[PDB]
Design a protein around this ligand. Structure first.
Ligand code: HEM
Ligand code: HEM
Ligand code: HNI
Ligand code: HNI
Lengths: 141, 146, 141, 146
């Protein structure tokens, strides 16, 4: 469960990210595709060329969902309900890949938040991203 | 992944009794029932709407034959699984776009199917040998991803 | 979440296990130690060889916890609360190992219950075992 | 494993800029903060009661530096990680009883620590090369388990 301290940490860190969220979402996707090439098996329909607008657009969608999850941190199952339906019934990404994207999101945050990415904030962000992932895979079967 | 001589013997002994066609269909069917998101790769196979629709689906069963045929062939080359599965690895990456995590899932489902068919004969040591095999096959099928 | 059919399936299968629950728990543990040697790191103080009184006793504990979970299938987070406290604060087993034991429990059940271990029942049992594992790792951080 | 010549060069260049005291203490400290159950292996280190206590703990800092020392040996022998880490693998299994899944956790914390220090310099390609490295180290450290 996300503690009050976790929620404070996540809200502060994502607040600092602010309007950079979409850019960071794209960067996290690019990091994931390069670092964990098996994740590209979910995007054979994408243009994956360097600086791909399609990847950037996707990064924005991922980031905006995360922004929403932060805004609704007390009730993520409800806030993410439509998205979790889509993941379970259409996208059907194997659960292991959520940990890969989550790690790449942490790396991206670490690379952009030198002051903010303390050990405690790192821990809270990791819990938050794992919780989002749990919600997104909750209806798989 | 290195089997002992006795493990190799046990794997080969058990496999001689396997109906590889039947077992392949059953393993692939159970994959699609137990982990239904894996149906994403088989939309063309028709009705996958219930456990029976999946298990008895003739296209699932026919495909399971291919899969287990290739697995059966790999059992003859336990010391060179990466080489054995290289062209299939490239195919599953470049043409089929299959996340290799699926190979790990299928291997464990296959182990369950072997236990179901063989009962007490699928002893803990025999299982341990087969776990080395399915881990090696999954790792081999993943190896040429890029 | 476990569906009505999942709960019917789990109750029927585990009920058929019946008096064998402890035997099958110990067999699952043995299968795990042989198949996945890294799981032995958690038992340096045990004889892990075949016929081990320690493995038999532990198998009985594991099986009895599963029987209690089946009895309280709609309240597992609370029924397993003390056990989850022990896991989070003492045992501290990495979550991957729960998947290994769960798989070994499925293999054991498959090997003993030819008629009962249908594809639908297998699916329900896997979900049930994953749900128990989730409860047992829920308080780690 | 499979570092390309250009990734080998990139890994070596970045590592030549790494402060081992800082990066080692931060990586081990963050393992213990982010995944607090791993503290089970480090009770003798004394006070691990808060993140500040962990990060400032002299034994955590010293040990993190030692761990990075072994990592440096790996980076100097990328074509034989299994041989490089054989003795340490045996130690971690036989004497320390450390589940190798923990090696993956440490590898990814190390990557986060490199990103945190280097910022934009820790580019996506550089990260990809380091992911191969940490995966290779974890796999080598796991290799002599039995
Ligand atoms: C033991 C592991 C596996 C082996 C040995 C194996 C082997 C094969 C073989 C021999 C083919 C035929 C290749 C061709 O068409 O040229 C094939 C096709 C295919 N496999 Fe795999 N396979 C394995 C696991 C999986 C898994 C787990 C999945 C996904 C859940 C998968 C998805 C596919 C798909 C989608 C095709 C093409 C099906 C079609 O023609 O519509 N495979 N596999
Ligand atoms: C994956 C990269 C790792 C490397 C390269 C590494 C390396 C080392 C080295 C060089 C030592 C000192 C060995 C000696 O005493 O001669 C050591 C000790 C130790 N390591 Fe590892 N380690 C790694 C990961 C881990 C992890 C993830 C854990 C636990 C979560 C761990 C637990 C320990 C423990 C408990 C000791 C003994 C500490 C003591 O003296 O009390 N190691 N390691
Ligand atoms: C490695 C694969 C993968 C992972 C782990 C993943 C993890 C996540 C996470 C977790 C933090 C979030 C918040 C997220 C959010 C989104 N993803 Ni993800 N996605 C992934 C692969 C996809 C794919 C594929 C699509 C479809 C994209 C397209 O345009 O076809 C997708 C679609 C989306 C959409 C658009 C839905 C719609 O059309 O309404 C959102 C939002 N997502 N994805
Ligand atoms: C691979 C490691 C491992 C896994 C995956 C695991 C998975 C599970 C699962 C999951 C289905 C269940 C229901 C379960 C139940 C139990 N475990 Ni587990 N345990 C594990 C390693 C332990 C260890 C270690 C102990 C202590 C044993 C001892 O006697 O020292 C333990 C002790 C217990 C006890 C006894 C607690 C007490 O003393 O009150 C129960 C009951 N368990 N364990």
């Amino acid at each position: 469960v996300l503690s009050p301290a976790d929620k404070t940490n996540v809200k502060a860190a994502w607040g600092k990210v602010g309007a950079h969220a979409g850019e960071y979402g794209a960067e996290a996707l690019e990091r994931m595709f390069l670092s964990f090439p098996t994740t590209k098996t979910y995007f054979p329909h994408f243009d994956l060329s360097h600086g791909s607008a399609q990847v950037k657009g996707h990064g924005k969608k991922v980031a905006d969902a995360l922004t929403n999850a932060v805004a609704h941190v007390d009730d993520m199952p409800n806030a993410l309900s439509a998205l979790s339906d889509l993941h379970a019934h259409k996208l059907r990404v194997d659960p292991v890949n959520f940990k890969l994207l989550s790690h790449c999101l942490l790396v991206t945050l670490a690379a952009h938040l030198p002051a903010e990415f303390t050990p405690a904030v790192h821990a809270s962000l990791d819990k938050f991203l794992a919780s989002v992932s749990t919600v997104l895979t909750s209806k798989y079967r | 992944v290195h089997l002992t001589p006795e493990e190799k013997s046990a794997v080969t002994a058990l496999w001689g009794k396997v109906n590889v066609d039947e077992v392949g269909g059953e393993a692939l069917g159970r994959l699609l029932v137990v982990y239904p998101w894996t149906q994403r790769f088989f939309e063309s196979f028709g009705d996958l709407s219930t456990p029976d629709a999946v298990m008895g689906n003739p296209k699932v069963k026919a495909h399971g034959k291919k899969v287990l045929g290739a697995f059966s062939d790999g059992l003859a080359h336990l010391d060179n699984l990466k080489g054995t599965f290289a062209t299939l690895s490239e195919l599953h990456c470049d043409k089929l776009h299959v996340d290799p995590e699926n190979f790990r899932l299928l291997g464990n489902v296959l182990v369950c199917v072997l236990a179901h068919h063989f009962g007490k004969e699928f002893t803990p040591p025999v299982q341990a040998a087969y776990q080395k095999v399915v881990a090696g096959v999954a790792n081999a099928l993943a190896h040429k991803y890029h």
